Amino acid sequence: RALPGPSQRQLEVYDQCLIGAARWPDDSSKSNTPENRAYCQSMYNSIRSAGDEISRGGITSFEELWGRATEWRLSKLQRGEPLYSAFASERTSDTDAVTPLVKPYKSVLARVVDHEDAHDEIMQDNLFGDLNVKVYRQTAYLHGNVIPLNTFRVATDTEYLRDRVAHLRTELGAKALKQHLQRYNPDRIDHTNASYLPIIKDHLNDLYRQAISSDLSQAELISLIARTHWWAASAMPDQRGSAAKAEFAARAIASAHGIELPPFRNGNVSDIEAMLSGEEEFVEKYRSLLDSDC
Amino acid sequence: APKFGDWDENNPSSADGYTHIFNKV
Ligand SMILES: C[C@@H]1O[C@H](OP(=O)(O)OP(=O)(O)OC[C@H]2O[C@@H](n3ccc(=O)[nH]c3=O)[C@H](O)[C@@H]2O)[C@H](O)[C@H](O)[C@H]1O
């Protein structure tokens, strides 16, 4: 059944230029720039065209949708082939994603440390040895079965470290210490094992199919949108760009039904808000993550 | 004690903050 399609009433432009922003609390400056506001407004446009086609039956699978997001994002890359290939390629089962918690991901470190669901564990490291780490272990539940996802760790014996790290550098050379930190920095996100991605993809086509219904109340539909956005962003299915892509999909599904969601709230980097939360936590909080203030 | 992650000051070997991809050991 065809759907109303994108709204005619459209976010004021101050908002459209925030669509997709990474409005880090600790440096919203980058949200304020000309090039970005260009990037975001581009996104807001390719979303809506995609919405147009969802509402008509042109996008059938969440995989075809994700193609529409991927396609868009690359067209915004002025970088080169080693960078074009990552944003274009699905993460595969013979590899492990990692994100060092450096900058701009320095705000996160508090979010893990004061997280109510945070553990206190030990990270056994061949160079620093044994370390205290506050740990969050995002998990998802599906068909009943538990899925582990991303794993936030923050080393806390911070004085040892700066002392230890300086130690280690002169021996192995910066060359071989950076090697370790690229893969074993004490503070780091260890992402959803790529092996889960086959099934997480079926579940996301199931989820998309339902939300392109025509009978859905305003509450459900959103509850569907928040989920999709949660599952994509948290599985991080592509080597690069998953963050944008996820938000692209979600917002395209919203405009299909004629909804015109706003930019997320400042300091609410949506992918990370979803990585540090369970499914139903995030479904509930979704509405307030959006700057729905007049 | 330093801030969390501020143990990694002025190190030339400080990681680059973005998603990396390695071979499964
Ligand atoms: C994030 C961390 O790194 C990866 O992101 P990646 O490095 O591939 O870059 P984006 O996801 O496109 O960028 C991250 C976010 O910044 C937005 N953006 C980017 C460039 C720009 O010029 N203007 C913008 O507004 C963009 O919309 C996206 O939502 C993973 O995805 C994962 O979510 C997490 O580990």
Residue numbers in the entry:
A (entry chain A): 27 to 320
B (entry chain B): 1, 149 to 172
Task: Reproduce text from the manuscript describing this model.
AvrB, a type III secretion system effector from the plant pathogen Pseudomonas syringae, is a member of the Fido (Fic, Doc, and AvrB) family that triggers HR in Arabidopsis plants to ward off systemic infection. Our investigations herein reveal the distinct and unexpected activity of AvrB acting as a glycosyltransferase that rhamnosylates residue T166 of Arabidopsis thaliana guardee protein RIN4. By elucidating the crystal structures of AvrB and its substrates across different enzymatic states, we provide an explanation for the specificity of substrates and delineate the step-by-step reaction mechanism executed by AvrB in the process of transferring rhamnose to RIN4. The identified biochemical activity of the avirulence protein AvrB as a rhamnosylator adds to the catalytic versatility of the Fido domain–containing protein superfamily.
Structures of AvrB + RIN4 [similar to a reported structure (19)], AvrB + RIN4 + UDP-rhamnose, AvrB + RIN4T166-Rha + UDP, and AvrBR266A + UDP together contribute to deciphering the catalytic mechanisms of AvrB as a rhamnosyltransferase. Because of its source from a plant bacterial pathogen, we hypothesized that AvrB may use UDP-rhamnose, a common plant metabolite. In the cosubstrate binding pocket, UDP-rhamnose adopts a conformation with rhamnose close to the hydroxyl group of T166 (prereaction state). UDP (free or in UDP-rhamnose) and rhamnose (in UDP-rhamnose) interact with AvrB directly and indirectly through water molecules (described in the figure legend). Contacts between UDP and AvrB: O2′-G46, α-PO4-R99, β-PO4-R266, and β-PO4-G267. Contacts between rhamnose and AvrB: O0″-T166 (RIN4), O0″-Y131, O2″-A269, O3″-D297, O4″-T166 (RIN4), and O4″-T125. The α-PO4 likely provides a driving force for priming the reaction by stabilizing the sugar moiety. dTDP-rhamnose could also be exploited by AvrB to rhamnosylate RIN4. Unlike the Fido enzyme AnkX that requires Mg2+ for catalysis, AvrB-catalyzed rhamnosylation of RIN4 does not require divalent cations. Thus, AvrB is a glycosyltransferase that uses UDP-rhamnose to rhamnosylate RIN4 on T166 in vitro.
